[PDB]
Write a protein that binds this ligand. Sequence first.
Ligand SMILES: [Ca+2]
Length: 248
Amino acid sequence: AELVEAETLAEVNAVQADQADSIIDHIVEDVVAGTLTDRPVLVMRTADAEESDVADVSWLLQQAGAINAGSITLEENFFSQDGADQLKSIVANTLPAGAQLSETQLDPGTHAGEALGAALLLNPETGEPLASTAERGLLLNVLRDNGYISYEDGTILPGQVIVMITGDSDGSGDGAFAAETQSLFARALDAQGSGVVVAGRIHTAADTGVIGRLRANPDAAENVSTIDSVNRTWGKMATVLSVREELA
Ligand SMILES: [Ca+2]
């Protein structure tokens, strides 16, 4: 008799599921579709980012008409104390021409963001790439060879906006250094023009989390868009809308 109740459960919830998909389809068409036509957007993802969050945001960017400028995974060593010294050395030795590392802020996030920003972004006033294809390949390959980043060969293009998708870390315990370095990294990318959207799950909005740190700084809160609920439907939509805000 238990096959009857499983049948009613499927009947009741299949109606609810179809209703939810219809709502979401309508939202995509009215909010996201066609809003980023021919705009190159690059996606960065931290090591602890949920793959569903990254795949969902990447799908919505494609639905908006954005050009897939590449997906770059920032491995654990990218934001760890252990890897700070070698990361600063790599970005210094492969620094593209026309890029200058900060002489007052010597943290790995600022330097890595200044170097990667020049390698991956377009001049927001002229549209020209900030670095040559050879300079971009050098930095990306040296970073990848040393285990700092992961990406697929020949899929990276210079973009107008970077969407960094983070995890669900509140910046407590040993996650503190990474959370702070991520915020300085995001501000450095934004300081190279163009535009940055940082998206994470709710715990990143803690005062010690990456988004909490960004929002607490008046300059960063005005310059870097932050989405604290990227695992929610409207959080994904707000991320895509924020890309168009950063472009304006
Ligand atoms: Ca900005």
